[PDB]
Amino acid sequence: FMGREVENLILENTQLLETKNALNIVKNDLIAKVDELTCEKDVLQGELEAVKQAKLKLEEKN
Amino acid sequence: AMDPEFMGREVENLILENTQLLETKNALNIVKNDLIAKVDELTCEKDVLQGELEAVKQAKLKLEEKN
Amino acid sequence: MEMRILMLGLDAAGKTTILYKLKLGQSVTTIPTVGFNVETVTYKNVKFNVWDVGGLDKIRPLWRHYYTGTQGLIFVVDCADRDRIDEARQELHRIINDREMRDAIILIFANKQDLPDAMKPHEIQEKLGLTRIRDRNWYVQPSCATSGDGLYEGLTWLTSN
Amino acid sequence: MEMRILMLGLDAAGKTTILYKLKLGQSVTTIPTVGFNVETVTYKNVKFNVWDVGGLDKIRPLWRHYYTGTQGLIFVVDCADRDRIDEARQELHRIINDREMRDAIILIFANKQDLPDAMKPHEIQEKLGLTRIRDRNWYVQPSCATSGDGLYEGLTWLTSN
Amino acid sequence: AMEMRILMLGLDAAGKTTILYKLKLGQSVTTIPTVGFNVETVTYKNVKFNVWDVGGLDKIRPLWRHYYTGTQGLIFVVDCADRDRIDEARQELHRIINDREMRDAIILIFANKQDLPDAMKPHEIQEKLGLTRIRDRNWYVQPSCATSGDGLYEGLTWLTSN
Ligand SMILES: Nc1nc2c(ncn2[C@@H]2O[C@H](COP(=O)(O)OP(=O)(O)OP(=O)(O)O)[C@@H](O)[C@H]2O)c(=O)[nH]1
Ligand SMILES: Nc1nc2c(ncn2[C@@H]2O[C@H](COP(=O)(O)OP(=O)(O)OP(=O)(O)O)[C@@H](O)[C@H]2O)c(=O)[nH]1
Ligand SMILES: Nc1nc2c(ncn2[C@@H]2O[C@H](COP(=O)(O)OP(=O)(O)OP(=O)(O)O)[C@@H](O)[C@H]2O)c(=O)[nH]1
Ligand SMILES: [Mg+2]
Ligand SMILES: [Mg+2]
Ligand SMILES: [Mg+2]
Numbered sequence: 001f002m003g004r005e006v007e008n009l010i011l012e013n014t015q016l017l018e019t020k021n022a023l024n025i026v027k028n029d030l031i032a033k034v035d036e037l038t039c040e041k042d043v044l045q046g047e048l049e050a051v052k053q054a055k056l057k058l059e060e061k062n
Numbered sequence: 063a064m065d066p067e068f069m070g071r072e073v074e075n076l077i078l079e080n081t082q083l084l085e086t087k088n089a090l091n092i093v094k095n096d097l098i099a100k101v102d103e104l105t106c107e108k109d110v111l112q113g114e115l116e117a118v119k120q121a122k123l124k125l126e127e128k129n
Numbered sequence: 130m131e132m133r134i135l136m137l138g139l140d141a142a143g144k145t146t147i148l149y150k151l152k153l154g155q156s157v158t159t160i161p162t163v164g165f166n167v168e169t170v171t172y173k174n175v176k177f178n179v180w181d182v183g184g185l186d187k188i189r190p191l192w193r194h195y196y197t198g199t200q201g202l203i204f205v206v207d208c209a210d211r212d213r214i215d216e217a218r219q220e221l222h223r224i225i226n227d228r229e230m231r232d233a234i235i236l237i238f239a240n241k242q243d244l245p246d247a248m249k250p251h252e253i254q255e256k257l258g259l260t261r262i263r264d265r266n267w268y269v270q271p272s273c274a275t276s277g278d279g280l281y282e283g284l285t286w287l288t289s290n
Numbered sequence: 291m292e293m294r295i296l297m298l299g300l301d302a303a304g305k306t307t308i309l310y311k312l313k314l315g316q317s318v319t320t321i322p323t324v325g326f327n328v329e330t331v332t333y334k335n336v337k338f339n340v341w342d343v344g345g346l347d348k349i350r351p352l353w354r355h356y357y358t359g360t361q362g363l364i365f366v367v368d369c370a371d372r373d374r375i376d377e378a379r380q381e382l383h384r385i386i387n388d389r390e391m392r393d394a395i396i397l398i399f400a401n402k403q404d405l406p407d408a409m410k411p412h413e414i415q416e417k418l419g420l421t422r423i424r425d426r427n428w429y430v431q432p433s434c435a436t437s438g439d440g441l442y443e444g445l446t447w448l449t450s451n
Numbered sequence: 452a453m454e455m456r457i458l459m460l461g462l463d464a465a466g467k468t469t470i471l472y473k474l475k476l477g478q479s480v481t482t483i484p485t486v487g488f489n490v491e492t493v494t495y496k497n498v499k500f501n502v503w504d505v506g507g508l509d510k511i512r513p514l515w516r517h518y519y520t521g522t523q524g525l526i527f528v529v530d531c532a533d534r535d536r537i538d539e540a541r542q543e544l545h546r547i548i549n550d551r552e553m554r555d556a557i558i559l560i561f562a563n564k565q566d567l568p569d570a571m572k573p574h575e576i577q578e579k580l581g582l583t584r585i586r587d588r589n590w591y592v593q594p595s596c597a598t599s600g601d602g603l604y605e606g607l608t609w610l611t612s613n
Binding site for chain 1: 064066069072073076077079080083084086087090091093094097098100101104105107108111112114115118119121122125126128129
């Protein structure tokens with residue numbers, strides 16, 4: 001009876017723990033990917049700048 | 063047999079922890095969804111930039127051939 | 130035109146092979162995916178954001194956390210794996226009946242068609258329990274990932290639907 | 291060199307203004323941030339990935355989920371908002387006492403120094419509980435985010451530490 | 452009025468004697484470098500400060516330690532226009548406060564000579580004196596100009612309040 005209140009909260013506790021663990025794994029994977037993508041975007045923007053300047057220098061020579 | 067005061071402490075402990083866990087599940091779901099949206103946005107923006115690089119590099123090639 | 134694609138299926142089915150054959154133009158070496166890959170593939174003026182999520186049994190419970198905003202599901206099946214085609218059916222119907230996935234268009238890649246005794250589309254259709262589903266848009270497309278056979282026909286259907 | 295930066299502070303402190311002043315070189319119009327902004331800012335040989343997360347009261351519980359991998363905390367304070375300085379103190383100490391934030395270096399932008407009624411850094415040293423922070427590496431930088439005054443000085447401190 | 456023993460230290464030329472007499476006499480006086488010490492009593496907000504100003508020239512700094520015992524507050528004065536010697540000031544500050552006989556003293560730092568162009572501000576002083584590294588001590592940085600008196604009573608206020 002008094003044991004029943006406690007058991008039911010405990011069961012609920014274990015499901016919440018499970019989903020929190022799963023969400024944390026996914027969330028952390030997602031953060032890593034955002035950080036990677038922002039850096040990659042930055043590198044590409046720099047690369048694009050350098051090639052665009054190289055076009056104008058080739059047009060100047062030509 | 064278990065003391066009522068112990069059973070009460072454990073009931074209170076679990077109510078607090080389950081409330082906290084529910085809040086963080088909700089929070090994590092929100093953060094995950096915000097992160098997914100940003101990943102999609104950044105992936106698209108990266109692709110636009112790759113396409114732009116390839117377009118300019120092709121022009122860079124034709125100008126080297128014309129030189 | 131933008132479409133968010135979730136690409137699921139059991140481990141070893143060919144998901145990552147398909148993703149990078151489409152993105153990089155060649156069959157690259159793959160290991161079982163921990164986490165996910167995501168790339169933007171443009172074909173027919175439509176820009177597909179394709180999420181490739183690890184299909185190992187251990188990490189399949191994680192798939193549901195990637196459903197948000199999905200407009201099309203790609204479910205990849207290893208057609209030479211008869212021992213797991215029913216496991217694949219169970220996983221498919223799990224996915225499509227989720228609230229976040231109920232409006233999603235369904236493309237099946239009947240993959241690994243190159244192998245000797247591999248199941249045909251209409252058999253894959255039957256084995257995956259799609260036949261009597263009149264309420265959802267679905268299609269079974271035969272494919273070879275490592276050669277790129279069938280892959281762009283798959284995307285054509287997604288663009289069409 | 292690479293540094294992951296998390297930028298926190300109460301709503302209206304000036305976090306997004308700072309991010310885009312650094313990134314774009316201009317003062318942009320903003321509204322309260324829902325979710326986050328993230329930009330790569332390059333300065334003095336260091337590539338800062340700066341995460342700017344919304345600071346409205348009801349979304350502060352979201353902050354702790356962005357802590358993972360943070361190497362530097364930027365905490366932004368509206369130095370004219372006298373009525374909320376104690377609130378800012380409470381939030382700052384909650385952040386730095388979290389297990390995932392124990393090793394982060396701490397840059398505090400004492401922001402909105404352009405305002406006639408803005409408090410100076412020395413006026414804030416106990417009101418923000420800074421003098422009682424133990425065993426950490428922290429620094430206060432006066433700033434005006436709209437003009438960019440103080441921002442590169444703050445970034446220099448981060449690079450030097 | 453409660454009594455409070457104050458030790459005022461800092462590098463030579465920081466402004467200690469200037470501060471002492473500004474507080475004691477209520478007027479700006481010309482100084483010479485201090486060999487030995489000055490001591491004056493100043494009353495403010497119901498506290499009687501007994502302030503010992505001890506010469507800061509390098510070769511007499513070892514004498515500072517003779518004044519540590521009984522000290523309830525340290526005033527450490529820094530010339531904020533002297534960037535070349537800020538590292539030396541940091542070294543001396545940490546030497547003082549780490550002494551067993553100074554462990555219970557509260558610490559007021561006068562970031563002095565704020566009137567001078569390009570003088571280091573309190574926030575810069577915090578960094579250059581390595582204040583972030585101080586553990587289990589009560590400290591505060593007060594900007595000041597000892598020639599005008601600006602900031603000095605704000606400094607004494609902090610001491611009275613602590
Ligand atoms: N013969 C043949 N092999 C394929 C085909 N597609 C993929 N493979 C191979 O199947 C193996 C597994 O492919 P993956 O792409 O890594 O499988 P996956 O679906 O991404 O598996 P997980 O990462 O665990 O989810 C690899 O050795 C691939 O080379 C195909 O169409 N035909
Ligand atoms: N006068 C003055 N206004 C500023 C300064 N910095 C930011 N602001 C203004 O303060 C308001 C809020 O700035 P935001 O950058 O959006 O604040 P935030 O910290 O990102 O707020 P949240 O997105 O809610 O977390 C805007 O109107 C800014 O223009 C400053 O240095 N001086
Ligand atoms: N411009 C400016 N000069 C100051 C200030 N405070 C002190 N001085 C000057 O700095 C010089 C040195 O001041 P002192 O008070 O003699 O320095 P001290 O710390 O007592 O030096 P020692 O006796 O060697 O320990 C004097 O010429 C003062 O007038 C200030 O706030 N601004
Ligand atoms: Mg894979
Ligand atoms: Mg904002
Ligand atoms: Mg003197």
